[PDB]
RNA sequence: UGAGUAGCGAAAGACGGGUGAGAAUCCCGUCCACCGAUUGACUAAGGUUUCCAGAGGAAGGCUCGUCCGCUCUGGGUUAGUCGGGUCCUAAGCUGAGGCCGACAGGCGUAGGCGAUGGAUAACAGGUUGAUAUUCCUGUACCACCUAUAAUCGAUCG
RNA sequence: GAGCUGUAAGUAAGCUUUGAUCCAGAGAUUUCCGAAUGGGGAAACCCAGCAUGAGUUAUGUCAUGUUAUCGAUAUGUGAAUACAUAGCAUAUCAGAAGGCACACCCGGAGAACUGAAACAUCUUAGUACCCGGAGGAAGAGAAAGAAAAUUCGAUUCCCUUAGUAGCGGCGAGCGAAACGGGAAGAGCCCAAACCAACAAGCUUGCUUGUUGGGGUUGUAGGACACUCUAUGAGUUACAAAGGACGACAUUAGACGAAUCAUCUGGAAAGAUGAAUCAAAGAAGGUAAUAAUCCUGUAGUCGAAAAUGUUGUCUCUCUUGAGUGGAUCCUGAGUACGACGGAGCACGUGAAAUUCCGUCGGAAUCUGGGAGGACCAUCUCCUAAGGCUAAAUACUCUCUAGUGACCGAUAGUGAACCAGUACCGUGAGGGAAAGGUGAAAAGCACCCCGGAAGGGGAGUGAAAUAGAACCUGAAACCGUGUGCU
C-alpha cells in the first residue's frame, strides 16, 4: 500500500478498506483486542490512497 | 557515541576497570546500561504477572560519559573520532584502527 | 454638510469675550440648497454662496 | 457517510434485555437525523427496519483528581426492526 | 490569650430485632405523636448529574456514622399528534433605498424579527433499580405520495 | 543512522537497515462559528430557494456548486410624459467591508485635577481619552528662502548659539531662529501659448472639445524665425513601464585536535607525582572543583528545494547644443483688504509673515512679492498644480549574544496544565503554590490494628532523606528533672 501510485482504480479499494474498518471498530466494544492492526495503520491507508489521486487530478487539469 | 552492540570499558562508577557488553541505551536520558555493573535490588510486591514477587537483583542504568569505547586492536580505551571513506562515515579509533565492533 | 468645489466644512476655534475668557464654538459656512444642472438628471444639493461662477439650473 | 454515521454499538443491562424484543441501540455521530440512521442499516446490516428513536446525553462532568473536564455529548439511537435477524454478535 | 467559656440554626419520640470491629443517630417492625386551603399530588422559572445500583470512610454534615444531596466504578432521558421551531401578529427592536449630521453615529418607510395571546391531529391500562400520552397491548385521527374508475372536454382559484 | 508510538509511568498488540520517530524546504487536507455574505438568530445553532446528481414504485432525505449590500462593466425594459432620464430585469468582475503591537507617525475633535501659595486671562497642554488613513518607516521637499559681507544655496536630524533676542495679570512661567561644526547627499514631471488630426457648431472662416507631439524657469526661461547635430548616454524606488541570460545571504547539518597512575571517599573532575595538545584556558553536563570524559569552542565545509540582496549582459528608450527676444503665454474669485479666530517662542500690540469662515476684490515683465507695520531707494526670488530615496523614531516578535540585574514575600501578576481558581449581573478586579536522592534503588517479608498509622527487617554514604520529603531558627504547646 505504500508507493502504490500506477493503478487507476483506486475507488474500488477505499471503499473496500473502509468497510473492513467498520469491521473491526464495531468490533472493538465487546472483545478482539489486537489493537496494532486496528485503526492506526488501517486508517492511515485510506490517507494514503486520497493524496494519490487528489493531485491525480491536479496534475491532469492544470 | 556508542551503539546497541558494543562492548566497552567504564572510567568512574562503584565498581570501575570492568569490562562488558550494551544491552540499552535511553538516549533522551543518555543513561547507558551494561551487564554486571551496579546491581540495583528492587523490592517487587506480589504484581498480577510475578506470582508472589519479590527481592531480585539486575543492573540498571549509569552515563555514557563513564564509559569508553576500547581498542579493539590494543585493549586500551580511546577517544573515537569520525572520518568517512566512500558514502557512509565510520568509526576510527584514533589509535589508527578503525572499529568492527558494532555487529 | 458640503460644498463642491471647495469642499467646504465648519472648522473650529475659541471665541471670546470682553475680559478674556473663552468657550468653543463652529463657523458654518454659508451653504444654499440650490438645484444644478449635474451630469445625467439635474440634483438639487447644497453649495456655498462664494462657489457662484456656475450656470444656475436647467 | 453511512459507512460511519453509526460508529459504535453499547451492550447494556438496559440493552442486552432490550435484545429480546428486538431492539438495537448504537451510537451515532453527532449531527446525523434519524431518517437517514435507517437509511444506514439498510446498508450495512441489508434488512428493513419499523422504526428509529433518538435522544441526547447532555456532556457531563468528569472527575476532579483528573482536573475539570466534561466527556464527549452523544447521540444513543435506538433502531426496531420488525423481522430482520441479530444482525451482530 | 479569651477557653475547654458562649454556641449547636424552631418542633415527640419509645422499644424490639438485624448489620457491624464500633450504634441515643444507619436498616426492618409494631406502638406513639405532627401538618392536612397543606410539611399533600402536579406543572412552568432556575439550577445543571445532584437521578438509580454496587462499593468505601481521609476530608464535608455545627455531635456521632456501618449512612448521605460528599468521594470511587458502571449505568439512566426514546415522541408525526406533549410543550416549541418548518404558521400569524402587539409593545418594542432592527431597517434596502432615503433623511440628518465635525468622525463614530441619530431617526425612519417596504420587510423580517418578536409570546405571556390567535390557530391547530390521542387515548385507556400494563412494565423497569432508574424514563413515559415518548417504549409494549388495543383502539382511531391529521398532511403528502403511488396503484385503485357512479362523472365530465369539470377542476385549481 | 537504531530505536520509536506527545507532555506520561503503566500497559497490550505493533512499527523498524527494504532507513523509522524526529530537523528544514515545498504541496494536498483544512469540519464550525466569526466583516458572515442565501434568510433568521441567545455566537459554535435553526429554516430554505436554484440547478445538477444518488436514492425509493414515488413523497420524505442526502451531496457538491449556487444566490447579502454598496461599486464597476454589459445588454433588456423604461413611467407621472411624447423625446429621454430616474426606476426595473438579467450576465460578468472581485474593488471594498473586518482585524491589527496600534508601540512609532499624519490629519479631525479635545477636558480637568494641579502651579500662581486663593482665582477669571494665562499654565498644567494642544498633554491623556475618542475617531479616521496609511507605512516599514510616515511628514517635510527642489526657494515668491536665509542674509547684508565677500554672499550660498532643496528638506530632515545631532552639538553649540542660549536659558540669550523676546513674550507675560511684564507675575508665575513659556522660549526661539540664522550664521557655525557634522550626519547622509538625486532632483524633477504637468497647465499655457503654438502646432498636427478628431468631432461639433456651421462653413474651406472662426470658436469649442478631445488626441498626440512640442515645453516647464528669474544671470528671464518658453512659443515663432535663424543654423547644427543622431542608434552616444539614461532605466524599471521619484523621472514610462515586464522580463529571460548570472555571484552572495537566510531556512536543516557535518568534521573538529590532547591523560594516566596512586590516596582518602558511597563516587573523583580534589590532594601528590608523572605526561600532552593549544587559531581550541568560552560554557554547561558527568556520583565533589575537569583545557585532554561527553556535548561543545577556534578554524574549516555543506544546500534537492524556496525566498532576499543582487554583479554582468539582454531589453526598453531615446537628438542635444546656440542666436534673435521686433510679437505671444506663464497656473483668478487666487494674492490681498474689512470683520471675529487659530497658529507662528510672540496673550492684537507698533504686528510682517501664515491657513479656515463671511463679504467686498488686482496687475500681468516698464510686471509680482519679501527683507518684523507702512512709503522711498537698493539687494534677493518668482505663489495660487503635482512626485521623491538617506541621515532619524519605534519593538508584540524572530536570530545570535552581554550584564558590580533578581534568586521564590525578590524577578513579569503569572518558574507550578495564570489572567487560571476565586469575587462581581455586569464593565472589570485577581491570588497562593519551586527543591527525595547520584540512580526509584519508592521499604519484600514478620508482628498489633477494620483500615490509617507503627515497631522490626531491607535499599541507600545518609531514611534522625520516607514522597506535607534538603537545611529546620522564633512565637507557642509539652515531658522527668538540680535549686526554690
Ligand atoms: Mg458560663
Ligand atoms: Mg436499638
Ligand atoms: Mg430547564
Ligand atoms: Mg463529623
Ligand atoms: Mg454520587
Ligand atoms: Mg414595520
Ligand atoms: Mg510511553
Ligand atoms: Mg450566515
Ligand atoms: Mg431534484
Ligand atoms: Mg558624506
Ligand atoms: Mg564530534
Ligand atoms: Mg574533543
Ligand atoms: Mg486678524
Ligand atoms: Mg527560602
Ligand atoms: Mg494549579
Ligand atoms: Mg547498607
Ligand atoms: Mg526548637
Redesign the pocket.
Same mark, same amino acid.
Request: hydrophobic share 30%.
Given at each position: 500500500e505504500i508507493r502504490d501510485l500506477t493503478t487507476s482504480e483506486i475507488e474500488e479499494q477505499i471503499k473496500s478498506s473502509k468497510e473492513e474498518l467498520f469491521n473491526l471498530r464495531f468490533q472493538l466494544a465487546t472483545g478482539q483486542?489486537?489493537?496494532?492492526?486496528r485503526i492506526?495503520?488501517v486508517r492511515k491507508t485510506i490517507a494514503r490512497l486520497?493524496?494519490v489521486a487528489?493531485?491525480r487530478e491536479?496534475e491532469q487539469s492544470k | 557515541?556508542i $551503539? $546497541?552492540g558494543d562492548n566497552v570499558k567504564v572510567?568512574?562508577?562503584?565498581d570501575?576497570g570492568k569490562e562488558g557488553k550494551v544491552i540499552?541505551?535511553? &538516549?533522551?536520558k543518555?543513561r547507558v546500561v551494561v551487564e554486571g555493573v551496579? %546491581?540495583? $535490588?528492587?523490592?517487587?510486591?506480589?504484581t498480577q504477572?510475578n506470582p508472589?514477587?519479590? %527481592?531480585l537483583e539486575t543492573e540498571?542504568?549509569?552515563?555514557?560519559?563513564?564509559?569508553?569505547l576500547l581498542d579493539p586492536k590494543t585493549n586500551? &580505551?580511546?577517544?573515537?573520532?569520525?572520518?568517512?571513506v566512500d558514502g557512509? $562515515?565510520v568509526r %576510527?579509533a584514533?589509535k589508527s584502527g578503525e572499529e568492527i565492533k558494532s555487529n | 454638510?458640503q460644498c463642491f468645489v471647495?469642499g +467646504?466644512?465648519?472648522?473650529?476655534?475659541?471665541? +471670546?469675550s470682553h475680559?478674556?475668557?473663552?468657550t468653543?464654538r +463652529?463657523?458654518?459656512?454659508?451653504?444654499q440648497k440650490v438645484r444644478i444642472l449635474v451630469d445625467?438628471?439635474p440634483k438639487k444639493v447644497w453649495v456655498?454662496? +462664494?462657489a457662484?461662477?456656475s450656470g444656475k439650473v436647467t | 457517510?453511512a459507512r460511519d454515521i453509526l460508529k459504535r454499538p453499547?451492550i #447494556?443491562?438496559?440493552?442486552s434485555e432490550?435484545m429480546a424484543?428486538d431492539?438495537y =441501540?448504537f451510537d451515532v455521530d453527532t449531527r446525523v437525523?434519524? =431518517?437517514?440512521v435507517?437509511?444506514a442499516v439498510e446498508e450495512i446490516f441489508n434488512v428493513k427496519v419499523?422504526?428509529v428513536?433518538?435522544?441526547?446525553? !447532555?456532556p457531563? !462532568?468528569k472527575?476532579?483528581?483528573?482536573?475539570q473536564g466534561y466527556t464527549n455529548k452523544r447521540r !444513543?439511537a435506538?433502531v #426496531?426492526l420488525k423481522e430482520g435477524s441479530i444482525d451482530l454478535f
Open positions: 483486542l489486537e489493537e496494532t492492526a492506526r495503520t486520497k493524496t487528489r493531485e491536479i | 557515541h $551503539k $546497541k572510567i568512574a562508577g562503584k570501575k540499552a541505551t535511553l &538516549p533522551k543518555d551496579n %546491581i540495583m $535490588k528492587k523490592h517487587q510486591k506480589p504477572l508472589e514477587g519479590g %527481592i540498571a542504568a549509569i552515563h555514557v560519559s563513564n564509559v569508553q586500551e &580505551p580511546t577517544r573515537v573520532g569520525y572520518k568517512f557512509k $562515515k %576510527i584514533k | 454638510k471647495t +467646504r466644512k465648519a472648522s473650529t476655534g475659541n471665541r +471670546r475680559a478674556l475668557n473663552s468653543k +463652529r463657523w458654518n459656512a454659508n451653504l445625467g438628471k456655498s454662496a +462664494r457662484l461662477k | 457517510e453499547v #447494556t443491562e438496559k440493552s432490550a424484543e431492539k =441501540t437525523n434519524k =431518517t437517514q435507517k437509511m419499523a422504526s428513536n433518538i435522544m441526547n446525553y !447532555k457531563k !462532568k472527575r476532579m483528581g483528573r482536573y !444513543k435506538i #426496531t
